[PDB]
Design a protein around this ligand. Structure first.
Ligand SMILES: [Fe+2]
Length: 187
């Protein structure tokens, strides 16, 4: 019932088709991304880690329709609470496990932020978020092993907001790439 990509390259080919116009079936994308069986022989050339923070490694630009990237989470690495500036956002596990915590949006009043959901993303599992679903923070569950995830954002975006969990106040942050197409980027 689900078209099963046999390689990362197959998955990318299918994604170019599914985002070629107008309407995106979210559950169809999610099922196809999940059906791909993570193969580190296929994506190790994008898995470039850093000691102190997670890295973002661009795989494909989707003919302007989306960004496909691989995020590398060192031991104990996690994100801040953030939004996804009005895009579709798909996140698939390639290695290890991520804990996702969904947060409610703050209002004007300064307040401790409220959790709405907490889960661990299993092996090969594909999760979905957008701004109407909530905010989230994502974290490697392991302090001894890495995590690796495949992210599709549509349309692409280069900025988002990070949120202070104690107050709900936010700051705009520019997203940078650690590498693109397997090639490390400058400082
Ligand atoms: Fe995110």
């Amino acid at each position: 019932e689900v078209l099963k990509p046999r390689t990362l390259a197959d998955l990318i080919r299918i994604l170019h088709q599914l985002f070629a116009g107008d309407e995106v079936n979210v559950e169809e994308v999610q099922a196809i991304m999940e059906a791909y069986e993570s193969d580190p022989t296929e994506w190790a050339m994008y898995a470039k880690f850093d000691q102190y923070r997670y890295t973002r490694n661009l795989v494909d630009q989707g003919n302007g329709k989306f960004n496909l990237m691989i995020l590398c989470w060192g031991e104990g690495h996690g994100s801040s609470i953030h939004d996804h500036t009005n895009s579709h956002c798909f996140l698939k596990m390639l290695q290890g496990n991520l804990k996702e915590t969904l947060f409610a949006w703050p209002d004007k009043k300064s307040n401790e932020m409220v959790k709405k959901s907490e889960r661990v993303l299993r092996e090969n599992q594909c999760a979905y978020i957008n701004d109407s679903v909530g905010l989230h923070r994502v974290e490697n569950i392991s302090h001894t092993e890495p995590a690796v995830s495949l992210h599709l954002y549509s349309p692409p975006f280069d900025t988002c907001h990070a949120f202070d969990q104690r107050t709900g106040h936010k700051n705009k942050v520019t997203m940078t790439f650690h590498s693109k197409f397997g090639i490390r980027t400058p400082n």
